[PDB]
Amino acid sequence: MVSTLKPLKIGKHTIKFPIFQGGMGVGISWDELAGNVAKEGALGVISAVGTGYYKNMRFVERIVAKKPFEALNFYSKKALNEIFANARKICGNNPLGANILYAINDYGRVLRDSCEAGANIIITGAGLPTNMPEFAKDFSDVALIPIISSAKALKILCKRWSDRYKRIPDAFIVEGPLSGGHQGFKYEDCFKEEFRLENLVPKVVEASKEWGNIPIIAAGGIWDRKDIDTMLSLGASGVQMATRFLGTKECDAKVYADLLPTLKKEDILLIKSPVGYPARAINTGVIKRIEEGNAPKIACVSNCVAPCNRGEEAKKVGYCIADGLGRSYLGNREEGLYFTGANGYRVDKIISVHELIKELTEG
Ligand SMILES: Cc1cc2nc3c(=O)[nH]c(=O)nc-3n(C[C@H](O)[C@H](O)[C@H](O)COP(=O)(O)O)c2cc1C
Ligand SMILES: Cc1cccc(NS(=O)(=O)c2nnc(NC(=O)c3ccc4ccccc4c3)s2)c1
Ligand code: SF4
């Protein structure tokens, strides 16, 4: 209960602790996880990606081959609505974020869906989101946070936003190459010291000065309070952590509770992705299937991302990301796709969200 960490303002919202739990798709950070995180005083973040899979396609208008049909059902507005409502059953009006990748043509639709669902903050990476306020203008209080890989991206985003909307972002998340999910770096760049998070945060904070010290949130490889204090000392206003929350009981993708305590370092790797960024995965499930020559059939049903071009890149790399992540949420251990930060092998026990926050904030 006693902490020396100080409350964090993001636009018009305040969170008790300067910690975000990073969004994780598909079905990893939904209502149980995000709700309990926000209940603890950190920022819970609901993933808006693949919400059609929620409760085994409870809220989709059409299913093909046990997949949500097209982007309208993959990014399901009614599913998102119920996920926010069920999270707020836990955390009340405590601030909640909605994480939405940029690499989708229906980006504005999902952004407005998140706003109408009750999100206080929109977080967007997997691209350079130069037009978030275009879609958020009916919702003045919703704070807008790009995820960036470099100080150059901060400067570009601030200039484009300022010139077009007379608004600049409410915060920036800089994500490094030790993160879960997709990386904002070429594979070769993920191993280079120049892109380590401790080197990115100083540059991004210095770039932020020019625009009035927009708060910076460091993400990628942050494990414990020592890492948090390191990032804060480098100028970051907060941290975003995901892998630690991937190992909590309240994770909405229950498979991880059985997968992580067995996870060995040598079974984490960077792979290719239809999204067009390296993805950090566990060497299990669909990956193993592909290497056996038992790859699931690929035929684009959910149309989840623009860079794939309705199956072109999925067929090239060998897997459909929507299919695999949805299968993981539904408990398919043989054909699921499973993601992790570099630190995933350090998960020994599955603990509660409350005990994790107590660890991260005590003192
Ligand atoms: C399993 C998993 C799935 C993720 N999926 C997404 C995602 O869909 N969208 C996103 O912006 N970030 C995603 N991330 C990245 C996290 O939000 C976060 O920025 C990063 O994992 C933090 O690093 P850490 O895991 O070392 O704390 C994912 C991370 C993990 C571990
Ligand atoms: C600027 C820049 C570039 C790259 C990464 C970052 N870093 S990041 O925005 O924090 C992210 N890390 N992982 C992410 N994963 C996803 O978008 C994702 C996860 C699951 C999907 C499933 C189906 C379809 C699309 C899907 C997309 S996004 C920042
Ligand atoms: S084939 Fe490509 S665009 Fe279609 S659902 Fe799979 S990854 Fe997404």
PDB file of C-alpha atoms in Angstrom, residues 81-207:
ATOM      1  CA  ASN A  81     -18.906  -3.059 -25.969  1.00  0.00           C
ATOM      2  CA  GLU A  82     -19.418  -6.065 -23.719  1.00  0.00           C
ATOM      3  CA  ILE A  83     -15.680  -6.319 -22.964  1.00  0.00           C
ATOM      4  CA  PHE A  84     -15.599  -2.723 -21.699  1.00  0.00           C
ATOM      5  CA  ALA A  85     -18.863  -3.201 -19.783  1.00  0.00           C
ATOM      6  CA  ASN A  86     -17.567  -6.346 -18.062  1.00  0.00           C
ATOM      7  CA  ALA A  87     -14.245  -4.663 -17.276  1.00  0.00           C
ATOM      8  CA  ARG A  88     -16.070  -1.752 -15.643  1.00  0.00           C
ATOM      9  CA  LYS A  89     -18.022  -4.218 -13.518  1.00  0.00           C
ATOM     10  CA  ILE A  90     -14.580  -4.719 -11.913  1.00  0.00           C
ATOM     11  CA  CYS A  91     -12.826  -1.345 -12.137  1.00  0.00           C
ATOM     12  CA  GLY A  92     -15.749   1.091 -12.219  1.00  0.00           C
ATOM     13  CA  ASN A  93     -14.883   4.399 -13.861  1.00  0.00           C
ATOM     14  CA  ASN A  94     -11.138   3.896 -13.385  1.00  0.00           C
ATOM     15  CA  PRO A  95      -9.332   4.745 -16.649  1.00  0.00           C
ATOM     16  CA  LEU A  96      -9.154   2.035 -19.306  1.00  0.00           C
ATOM     17  CA  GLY A  97      -7.353   2.060 -22.620  1.00  0.00           C
ATOM     18  CA  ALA A  98      -8.170   0.497 -25.970  1.00  0.00           C
ATOM     19  CA  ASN A  99      -5.264  -0.796 -28.052  1.00  0.00           C
ATOM     20  CA  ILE A 100      -5.807  -0.694 -31.810  1.00  0.00           C
ATOM     21  CA  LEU A 101      -3.185  -1.467 -34.447  1.00  0.00           C
ATOM     22  CA  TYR A 102      -2.758   1.076 -37.210  1.00  0.00           C
ATOM     23  CA  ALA A 103      -2.320  -1.369 -40.127  1.00  0.00           C
ATOM     24  CA  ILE A 104      -6.059  -1.721 -40.901  1.00  0.00           C
ATOM     25  CA  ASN A 105      -8.251   0.106 -43.416  1.00  0.00           C
ATOM     26  CA  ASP A 106     -11.086   0.032 -40.863  1.00  0.00           C
ATOM     27  CA  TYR A 107      -8.890   1.874 -38.360  1.00  0.00           C
ATOM     28  CA  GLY A 108     -11.230   4.832 -37.905  1.00  0.00           C
ATOM     29  CA  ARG A 109     -14.243   2.577 -37.417  1.00  0.00           C
ATOM     30  CA  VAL A 110     -12.525   0.616 -34.651  1.00  0.00           C
ATOM     31  CA  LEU A 111     -11.270   3.839 -33.035  1.00  0.00           C
ATOM     32  CA  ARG A 112     -14.791   5.257 -32.872  1.00  0.00           C
ATOM     33  CA  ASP A 113     -16.041   1.867 -31.654  1.00  0.00           C
ATOM     34  CA  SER A 114     -13.546   2.020 -28.794  1.00  0.00           C
ATOM     35  CA  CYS A 115     -14.587   5.573 -27.929  1.00  0.00           C
ATOM     36  CA  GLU A 116     -18.286   4.646 -28.015  1.00  0.00           C
ATOM     37  CA  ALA A 117     -17.495   1.577 -25.887  1.00  0.00           C
ATOM     38  CA  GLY A 118     -16.141   3.804 -23.109  1.00  0.00           C
ATOM     39  CA  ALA A 119     -12.379   3.878 -23.650  1.00  0.00           C
ATOM     40  CA  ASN A 120     -10.649   6.808 -21.981  1.00  0.00           C
ATOM     41  CA  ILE A 121      -7.396   6.334 -23.931  1.00  0.00           C
ATOM     42  CA  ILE A 122      -6.581   4.978 -27.405  1.00  0.00           C
ATOM     43  CA  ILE A 123      -3.152   3.389 -27.892  1.00  0.00           C
ATOM     44  CA  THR A 124      -1.983   2.669 -31.430  1.00  0.00           C
ATOM     45  CA  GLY A 125       1.162   1.164 -32.926  1.00  0.00           C
ATOM     46  CA  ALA A 126       2.033  -1.162 -35.815  1.00  0.00           C
ATOM     47  CA  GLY A 127       2.422   1.875 -38.038  1.00  0.00           C
ATOM     48  CA  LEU A 128       2.730   5.655 -37.920  1.00  0.00           C
ATOM     49  CA  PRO A 129      -0.739   6.874 -36.780  1.00  0.00           C
ATOM     50  CA  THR A 130      -0.749  10.407 -38.147  1.00  0.00           C
ATOM     51  CA  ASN A 131      -4.558  10.821 -38.112  1.00  0.00           C
ATOM     52  CA  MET A 132      -5.900   9.552 -34.755  1.00  0.00           C
ATOM     53  CA  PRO A 133      -7.703  12.880 -34.019  1.00  0.00           C
ATOM     54  CA  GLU A 134      -9.591  12.683 -37.336  1.00  0.00           C
ATOM     55  CA  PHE A 135     -11.559   9.789 -35.889  1.00  0.00           C
ATOM     56  CA  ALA A 136     -11.538  10.898 -32.235  1.00  0.00           C
ATOM     57  CA  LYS A 137     -12.978  14.423 -32.632  1.00  0.00           C
ATOM     58  CA  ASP A 138     -16.497  13.547 -31.444  1.00  0.00           C
ATOM     59  CA  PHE A 139     -14.860  12.334 -28.181  1.00  0.00           C
ATOM     60  CA  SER A 140     -12.840  15.284 -26.898  1.00  0.00           C
ATOM     61  CA  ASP A 141     -11.763  13.694 -23.594  1.00  0.00           C
ATOM     62  CA  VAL A 142     -10.305  10.469 -25.021  1.00  0.00           C
ATOM     63  CA  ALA A 143      -6.517  10.690 -24.771  1.00  0.00           C
ATOM     64  CA  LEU A 144      -4.505   9.545 -27.788  1.00  0.00           C
ATOM     65  CA  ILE A 145      -1.181   7.682 -27.495  1.00  0.00           C
ATOM     66  CA  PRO A 146       0.946   6.552 -30.437  1.00  0.00           C
ATOM     67  CA  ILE A 147       3.488   3.802 -29.989  1.00  0.00           C
ATOM     68  CA  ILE A 148       6.784   4.747 -31.631  1.00  0.00           C
ATOM     69  CA  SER A 149      10.184   3.190 -32.259  1.00  0.00           C
ATOM     70  CA  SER A 150      12.304   6.350 -32.519  1.00  0.00           C
ATOM     71  CA  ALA A 151      12.559  10.052 -31.720  1.00  0.00           C
ATOM     72  CA  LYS A 152      12.154  10.780 -35.443  1.00  0.00           C
ATOM     73  CA  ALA A 153       8.661   9.271 -35.289  1.00  0.00           C
ATOM     74  CA  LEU A 154       7.801  11.487 -32.316  1.00  0.00           C
ATOM     75  CA  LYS A 155       8.843  14.603 -34.231  1.00  0.00           C
ATOM     76  CA  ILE A 156       6.969  13.571 -37.386  1.00  0.00           C
ATOM     77  CA  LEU A 157       3.778  12.676 -35.515  1.00  0.00           C
ATOM     78  CA  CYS A 158       3.830  15.895 -33.488  1.00  0.00           C
ATOM     79  CA  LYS A 159       4.287  18.020 -36.616  1.00  0.00           C
ATOM     80  CA  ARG A 160       1.592  16.279 -38.688  1.00  0.00           C
ATOM     81  CA  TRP A 161      -0.894  16.334 -35.788  1.00  0.00           C
ATOM     82  CA  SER A 162      -0.163  19.961 -34.894  1.00  0.00           C
ATOM     83  CA  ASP A 163      -0.440  21.197 -38.476  1.00  0.00           C
ATOM     84  CA  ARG A 164      -3.638  19.299 -39.265  1.00  0.00           C
ATOM     85  CA  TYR A 165      -5.629  19.230 -35.996  1.00  0.00           C
ATOM     86  CA  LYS A 166      -4.015  21.869 -33.723  1.00  0.00           C
ATOM     87  CA  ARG A 167      -3.554  18.990 -31.257  1.00  0.00           C
ATOM     88  CA  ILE A 168      -0.512  16.927 -30.292  1.00  0.00           C
ATOM     89  CA  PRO A 169      -0.522  13.459 -28.690  1.00  0.00           C
ATOM     90  CA  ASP A 170      -1.334  13.106 -25.009  1.00  0.00           C
ATOM     91  CA  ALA A 171       1.572  10.680 -24.507  1.00  0.00           C
ATOM     92  CA  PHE A 172       4.013   8.532 -26.445  1.00  0.00           C
ATOM     93  CA  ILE A 173       4.938   4.907 -25.806  1.00  0.00           C
ATOM     94  CA  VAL A 174       8.419   4.050 -27.038  1.00  0.00           C
ATOM     95  CA  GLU A 175       8.652   0.281 -27.496  1.00  0.00           C
ATOM     96  CA  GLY A 176      11.973  -1.536 -27.724  1.00  0.00           C
ATOM     97  CA  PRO A 177      12.978  -4.798 -29.402  1.00  0.00           C
ATOM     98  CA  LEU A 178      12.625  -6.997 -26.282  1.00  0.00           C
ATOM     99  CA  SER A 179       8.837  -6.629 -26.421  1.00  0.00           C
ATOM    100  CA  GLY A 180       6.059  -9.107 -27.051  1.00  0.00           C
ATOM    101  CA  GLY A 181       4.050  -9.224 -30.234  1.00  0.00           C
ATOM    102  CA  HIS A 182       5.452  -7.345 -33.209  1.00  0.00           C
ATOM    103  CA  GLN A 183       8.662  -5.297 -33.155  1.00  0.00           C
ATOM    104  CA  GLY A 184       9.102  -1.816 -34.578  1.00  0.00           C
ATOM    105  CA  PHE A 185      12.540  -2.807 -35.889  1.00  0.00           C
ATOM    106  CA  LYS A 186      14.023  -4.920 -38.667  1.00  0.00           C
ATOM    107  CA  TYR A 187      15.061  -8.364 -37.409  1.00  0.00           C
ATOM    108  CA  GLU A 188      18.745  -7.439 -37.699  1.00  0.00           C
ATOM    109  CA  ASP A 189      18.113  -4.233 -35.754  1.00  0.00           C
ATOM    110  CA  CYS A 190      16.455  -6.100 -32.868  1.00  0.00           C
ATOM    111  CA  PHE A 191      19.863  -7.378 -31.694  1.00  0.00           C
ATOM    112  CA  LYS A 192      21.774  -4.099 -31.947  1.00  0.00           C
ATOM    113  CA  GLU A 193      22.701  -2.171 -28.813  1.00  0.00           C
ATOM    114  CA  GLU A 194      21.802   1.144 -30.463  1.00  0.00           C
ATOM    115  CA  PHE A 195      18.098   0.232 -30.267  1.00  0.00           C
ATOM    116  CA  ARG A 196      18.050  -1.023 -26.674  1.00  0.00           C
ATOM    117  CA  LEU A 197      15.269   0.628 -24.701  1.00  0.00           C
ATOM    118  CA  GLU A 198      17.719   2.347 -22.325  1.00  0.00           C
ATOM    119  CA  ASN A 199      19.163   4.070 -25.392  1.00  0.00           C
ATOM    120  CA  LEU A 200      15.829   4.942 -27.020  1.00  0.00           C
ATOM    121  CA  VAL A 201      14.197   6.555 -23.969  1.00  0.00           C
ATOM    122  CA  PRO A 202      16.757   9.409 -23.568  1.00  0.00           C
ATOM    123  CA  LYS A 203      16.480  10.325 -27.261  1.00  0.00           C
ATOM    124  CA  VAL A 204      12.675  10.260 -27.240  1.00  0.00           C
ATOM    125  CA  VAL A 205      12.479  12.348 -24.047  1.00  0.00           C
ATOM    126  CA  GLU A 206      14.875  14.912 -25.511  1.00  0.00           C
ATOM    127  CA  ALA A 207      12.782  15.029 -28.690  1.00  0.00           C
TER     128      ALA A 207
END
